[PDB]
Amino acid sequence: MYHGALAQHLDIAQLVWYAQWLVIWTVVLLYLRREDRREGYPLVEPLGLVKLAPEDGQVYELPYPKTFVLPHGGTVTVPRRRPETRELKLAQTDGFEGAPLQPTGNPLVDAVGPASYAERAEVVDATVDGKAKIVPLRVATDFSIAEGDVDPRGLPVVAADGVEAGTVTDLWVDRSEHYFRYLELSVAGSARTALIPLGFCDVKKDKIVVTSILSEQFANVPRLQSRDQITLREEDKVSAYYAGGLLYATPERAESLL
Amino acid sequence: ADYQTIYTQIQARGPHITVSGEWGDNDRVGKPFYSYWLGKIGDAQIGPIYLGASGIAAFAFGSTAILIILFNMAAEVHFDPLQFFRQFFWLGLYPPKAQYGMGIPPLHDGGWWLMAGLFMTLSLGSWWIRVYSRARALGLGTHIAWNFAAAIFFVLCIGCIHPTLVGSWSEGVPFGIWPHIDWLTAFSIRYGNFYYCPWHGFSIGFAYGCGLLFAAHGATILAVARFGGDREIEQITDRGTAVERAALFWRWTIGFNATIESVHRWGWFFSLMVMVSASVGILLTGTFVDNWYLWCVKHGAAPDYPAYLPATPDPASLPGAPK
Amino acid sequence: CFEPPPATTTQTGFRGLSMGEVLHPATVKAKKERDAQYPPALAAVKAEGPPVSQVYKNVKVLGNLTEAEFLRTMTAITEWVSPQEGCTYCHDENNLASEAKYPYVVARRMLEMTRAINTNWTQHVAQTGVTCYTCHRGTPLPPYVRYLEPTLPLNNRETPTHVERVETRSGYVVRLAKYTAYSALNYDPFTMFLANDKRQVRVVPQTALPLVGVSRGKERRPLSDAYATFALMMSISDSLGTNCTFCHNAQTFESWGKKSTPQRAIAWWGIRMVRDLNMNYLAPLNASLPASRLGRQGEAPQADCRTCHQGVTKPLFGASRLKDYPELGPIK
Amino acid sequence: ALLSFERKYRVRGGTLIGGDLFDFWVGPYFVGFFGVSAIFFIFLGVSLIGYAASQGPTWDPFAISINPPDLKYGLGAAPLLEGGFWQAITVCALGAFISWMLREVEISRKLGIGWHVPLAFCVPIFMFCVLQVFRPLLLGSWGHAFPYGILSHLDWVNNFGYQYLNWHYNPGHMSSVSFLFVNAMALGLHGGLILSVANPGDGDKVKTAEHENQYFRDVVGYSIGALSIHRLGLFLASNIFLTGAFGTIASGPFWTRGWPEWWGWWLDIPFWS
């Protein structure tokens, strides 16, 4: 006799082989792939005429809604319907649905393509204690630049075209993670300040190089509602403006690199 | 290029943060000190550290196991300091060499090994409590502890469960650098080549998979660091452009995508399955399968090849051949 | 701490299986030169006159040879075994029939052993055969022998450090490692598998599922058996200056047919030959050797694969003297 | 068709080559010039595999095996059935992998995100080249490369390792394995930490970045940080192959003995010998 041998010419390991695959596919398809759909669903498509076709499939692929109880009050439920009625200054380039869209105006200002921001909440991200998380050092006086690193305060900001766009006036730090996330500068020729994510900054000892946008485009950087405070959506608007420059700073950037 | 993804150009400093737990706040010891260079690629703050009964116990049980092993290793070189340093990697504490079944082997042939295993196990269990309780104390889910439990379970599988299932302590993993490595080949050989064990294959698929996923996820978050993608918690509760772009990158590349929260579930799952798959494989080995290669031949999966040099009949089966 | 390319590689298995030898040219060259020291065969002599069984007085093995043929054998033996010591190593210069010197009696037994090897173990030595030189290489004490406990250096012609000395307990692990291609396997494959026929090398099941009756508790061979067999294979590989794929398709070490090369079968016969040599010819010699030749357990030095092969898949790369000295076998 | 937030991102541009020619989507998939070349290489490679297999002894998924040429063919071409198919399939594979990587660059460009993913993907492509091209080139024969078979490639890995007696003692392997283990462990830690903070359970409140850092500071006395754990993860994963490659390339071209013996550089120092 043999340990593991069963009737019908089969054995225990052989059965477990099928069971393992069943467990794997069940978790992957029924659980994980549904968790993957808590954002962006149900999908959308051009109608042109009032029609109703929810489709069983749109219900089957979704998991039951979950609700997050926020640390500072309120709740968030996903998935949930989140239509984007915001007018997009984009036009079709061709007829087929797979065709890309083309901006109709200034993509950076209109916020389309890589210049798009998400409809995040217009609330100030908070520290565990309920204070504003991302703030300038003028406010977070108990914070400072580590000894050994460049203090950008006072340095000029040089855009992709080589011309000075303004002067750095402060640094916005993440009080929750002790990490700088933005630099604030005065825009030359204009009468305003503007933030820029550090990820778009090449910090040199004598200057801050920014290749994402040209000097002139600094004038239209999204503005904050408050001076020493920034909302989650504003951070998205600011970061997205510069990213948009990577593809739209000049007409050439959107065309093939090679 | 986003230089911030390589290292932190301008580091920040501020009062250290302390999040109160339901208990144990008075068990935190030390004074946080900072490292400027570590701050280039990570948080500059080191310490303080939490003590607590679980952690202390873990070190007590662990230190004992370690001393049992080190002492037996020292005996291997007749307690000579120079040879101990030189031969370290080659030294080890072995399970019983003789077959006593499940009988407690004498100290000189498996006894000390069994003792070290017991203390290591207690050490692992104690540290698990720390991993679990710290989460609950800080009001966090226990996802990490459940993953850690699977890793611990696998160690128990190769350490004592498989041995108990076949009825022999001689099958355990010895303690030592090279010695625990040698066991791998001894075990694979004894059970007909582990490459043919499906669960060895599953475990590898998930391990390689973890490599693929962390490289992919790590790179994805760095790619959207300019949009604050690293602040995953709030990207989960309030989707930002960082994760919309991350999702679209993958959707446009492979045809489907995850969410900033679910990708962590995929990673947690893949990591978990490395240990779960390995454990199932070890539980089936010796218990219900004796030779994995032959098991695959039996089920028609094993590849076969023509001979290059002449096919060679087993000499032992030839007519008139000796024993 | 590396070997500069190119590397010589051969194929020993179906294409795509990564099977074959991996050799370093400079090493191969150095070994061929060492082995090339094999003295050439002595000039042939006319077989004239009566057999030495009538001419001499104490010839028991080579009695059928003529005087000239016989003296030719003695010259070769001196060349192969004691070229530095000379005829008197085994002989009393005043009475060539005397057995007073211990090497004489041992040599006679060795003549019988050599003839047995070339006559009874052709399954291993084929028509290449062996001569006294194969093992001795020009010295009374063969450079590569084994005792009942691992010894270092492997080549006894090299002066051992204090830690290599078998009396120094602190160096045991190293004495073991250097006998198993530097692995940390805690087993001595010589005493376990080559000194005698008490153990089985095979440790892999021949069925997919565990047979009820031999797969639980004390019915089972300890896993240590698998480590030990792995140790023997590491030792065998190093002894022949080759790797596992020279004999096995690692897909299944336990299978023969297309899963093993002809060399593996020859190796199998070699294990039987060595056990025969050790149990029936070499081990019994401890009663004829001086205490200074015996191991700490009173054992006489014995043979393993390296004793003849000395790092080459074929001893002396296949060199032969079989036809030059038919008196050494095969004996019809 | 489109995720609810996807439309605004589907703009033209970002390509490396081709421009508007292939700048479009097919279902969820972005095409692009490299999307076209990828499909080309995939179709060709898979077709070659299928035809090569049809000339083989079996249709079983696990047993099928398309192998390289005998070592004797060196770096030259070999008859189709005797390694030729394998050679063609290898070229298609490389073309497909590289096209896939460059396509990811175009997708990254269009979205305005960093090129970190495709850059990371270059690592496994590189390892594939180390195994199938670089090492075989150094040894002088395509025949040293691994075969294409679900189980047969394991037989190759197996024999390759044993060609050096015990591959586990290979220093480059030891590094590679350590990175594999720590990366799998770290991924579990990272995924678990994030999930534990967003899912405290029992109706409790979602926690914070502060709680994140507090957890590991308490458990191990240090917390690398939110952004840093992602850089670390990419570093750990990448090094599985970046360091492993050295152990692979060294076996044969720079070392022909067993790997355990290599450690003689340490063990055989006369001082303690």
Ligand code: BCB
């Ligand atoms: C130096 C060592 C090597 C190695 C060692 C290795 C081991 C030891 C094991 C595997 C295993 C596996 N390997 Mg192999 N491997 C494979 C593919 C595979 C899979 C059949 C399987 C699981 C892989 C996985 O899930 O991780 C990546 C993970 C994920 C989650 C993404 C999905 C990947 C998908 C499963 C790949 C499917 C590939 C297809 C079967 C064939 C592709 C071509 C077709 C379409 C024509 C590829 C495609 C390549 C290439 C192109 O180089 C490769 C190279 C190598 N493997 C090296 C030669 N691999 C395991 C196995 O079960 O083998 C039977 C196993 O035990």
Ligand code: BCB
């Ligand atoms: C010749 C021998 C072979 C072999 C033998 C082997 C065996 C015998 C086993 C594996 C197993 C496994 N192998 Mg295989 N293997 C693998 C990969 C893998 C892993 C995916 C998997 C699980 C091991 C693990 O994660 O442990 C790393 C993780 C561990 C050990 C968990 C530790 C957790 C713990 C809490 C840590 C504690 C730390 C404390 C500080 C300790 C303190 C101690 C003190 C107190 C004393 C690959 C990719 C390859 C290739 C490329 O060839 C391969 C080839 C082979 N393996 C050969 C065929 N392999 C296992 C398996 O899956 O079997 C089915 C297994 O048991």
Ligand code: BCB
């Ligand atoms: C008996 C033989 C042994 C052996 C022999 C061995 C060799 C010979 C080599 C390794 C290597 C490696 N081994 Mg070792 N090994 C490992 C682990 C590992 C890996 C970390 C490492 C790299 C694997 C690799 O190259 O993938 C390669 C994977 C590639 C190239 C994947 C490329 C993917 C591609 C870009 C895209 C593919 C796409 C698909 C076709 C898509 C399909 C379509 C679908 C998905 C839609 C462990 C943990 C163990 C254990 C537990 O014992 C072990 C034991 C052993 N290994 C044995 C001792 N191992 C390698 C190494 O680094 O050594 C230093 C190596 O060369």
Ligand SMILES: C/C=C1/c2cc3[nH]c4c(c3C)C(=O)[C@H](C(=O)OC)c4c3nc(cc4[nH]c(cc(n2)[C@@H]1C)c(C(C)=O)c4C)[C@@H](C)[C@@H]3CCC(=O)OC/C=C(\C)CCC[C@@H](C)CCC[C@@H](C)CCCC(C)C
């Ligand atoms: C697929 C998923 C996997 C996975 C998962 C997870 N892995 C986890 C967790 C999860 C989820 C945790 O939550 C837990 C953790 O906390 O993370 C930070 C942990 C851990 N994984 C560790 C090691 C590890 N994981 C491995 C593998 C995998 N992990 C696989 C891959 C491997 C491999 C590959 O070998 C290793 C080596 C530890 C760091 C840690 C346990 C600590 C412990 O339990 O120790 C218990 C305590 C002790 C042994 C005492 C230590 C005493 C020391 C300091 C010596 C003192 C000597 C002194 C007294 C001498 C004096 C005398 C002398 C001078 C003469």
Ligand SMILES: C/C=C1/c2cc3[nH]c4c(c3C)C(=O)[C@H](C(=O)OC)c4c3nc(cc4[nH]c(cc(n2)[C@@H]1C)c(C(C)=O)c4C)[C@@H](C)[C@@H]3CCC(=O)OC/C=C(\C)CCC[C@H](C)CCC[C@H](C)CCCC(C)C
């Ligand atoms: C160190 C870092 C690691 C790492 C990293 C990353 N990994 C990535 C990315 C990153 C960052 C991506 O961005 C990219 C991706 O999109 O993710 C979703 C990707 C991907 N990693 C895949 C497989 C994978 N990653 C492995 C390993 C690691 N990944 C290591 C650990 C392994 C191992 C271990 O075996 C596997 C099997 C695919 C799923 C996917 C490419 C699909 C493709 O290229 O499309 C183009 C090609 C095809 C769809 C098919 C081509 C078929 C050819 C023509 C015919 C067959 C030829 C073939 C040689 C036959 C082999 C047979 C086999 C039995 C032997």
Ligand SMILES: CC(C)=CCC/C(C)=C/CC/C(C)=C/CC/C(C)=C/CC/C(C)=C/CC/C(C)=C/CC/C(C)=C/CC/C(C)=C/CC/C(C)=C/CC1=C(C)C(=O)c2ccccc2C1=O
């Ligand atoms: C002969 C023959 C073969 C003929 C047919 C050829 C063919 C394929 C034709 C198709 C049709 C045509 C002509 C199409 C044109 C367009 C085109 C270029 C199509 C491509 C088709 C194709 C080749 C598809 C295969 C795609 C593919 C390689 C899939 C692999 C999927 C696998 C196994 C991935 C491994 C990793 C894994 C387990 C992932 C799951 C979890 C996910 C989704 C992680 C990604 C992810 C990460 C990592 C985040 O960090 C993240 C952060 C925040 C939000 C989201 C995410 C997120 O989604």
Ligand code: HEC
């Ligand atoms: C030991 C390794 C030997 C060396 C060196 C030499 N001889 Fe030898 N010889 C040896 C043995 C074992 C025997 C007996 C052979 C047998 O078949 O029994 C002999 C015998 C002789 C004899 C015969 C003496 C007699 O019985 O009358 C002679 C003449 C002889 N040996 C000569 C000889 C010479 C000249 C040597 C150096 C060239 C020499 N022997 C070396 C063993 C060994």
Ligand code: HEC
């Ligand atoms: C390897 C298989 C051998 C062959 C072939 C021959 N000999 Fe040998 N011999 C061998 C060993 C392992 C030993 C034991 C160790 C030792 O040195 O004693 C010997 C020993 C002798 C001796 C005595 C050596 C001494 O102690 O002084 C002699 C004189 C001797 N062998 C002679 C000899 C002759 C004449 C051979 C060919 C006919 C011959 N040996 C072959 C191993 C092997």
Ligand code: HEC
């Ligand atoms: C030919 C010279 C060999 C080399 C080189 C290696 N092996 Fe071997 N192996 C060989 C033989 C003749 C035998 C059988 C001996 C007998 O008395 O039956 C073996 C056996 C094994 C086994 C056991 C198989 C079984 O049936 O249980 C294993 C697992 C094995 N060999 C492994 C192995 C490895 C890893 C090697 C390189 C380090 C290796 N062998 C080399 C002959 C030869």
Ligand code: HEC
């Ligand atoms: C001298 C008495 C030997 C001992 C001890 C061992 N081997 Fe041997 N081996 C010997 C000879 C004279 C030959 C040559 C055969 C030829 O055709 O030239 C061999 C051959 C082998 C081979 C085959 C080599 C090949 O064909 O390429 C192998 C694999 C082999 N020997 C293995 C082997 C092993 C494993 C041994 C110890 C158990 C062993 N041999 C001892 C002589 C002697």
Ligand SMILES: CC(C)=CCC/C(C)=C/C=C/C(C)=C/C=C/C(C)=C/C=C\C=C(C)\C=C\C=C(/C)CC/C=C(\C)CCCC(C)C
């Ligand atoms: C006792 C009875 C009745 C029942 C059984 C009890 C039981 C639960 C037994 C369990 C056994 C188990 C789980 C055994 C498992 C063994 C395993 C998996 C071991 C694996 C590998 C071990 C290795 C790598 C250990 C290496 C150890 C050493 C290097 C020595 C330790 C050294 C240190 C950690 C610090 C460095 C010290 C040095 C500088 C001097």
Ligand SMILES: CCCCCCCCCCCC[N+](C)(C)[O-]
């Ligand atoms: C594996 C058994 C270990 C027993 C010894 C360790 C006990 C630790 C108890 C910790 C109690 C923690 N607490 C207070 C949070 O409940």
Ligand SMILES: CCCCCCCCCCCC[N+](C)(C)[O-]
């Ligand atoms: C060891 C193999 C583990 C495989 C785990 C699953 C791999 C990824 C599966 C993706 C499936 C995608 N989709 C859209 C069909 O759901």
Ligand SMILES: [Fe+2]
């Ligand atoms: Fe993450």
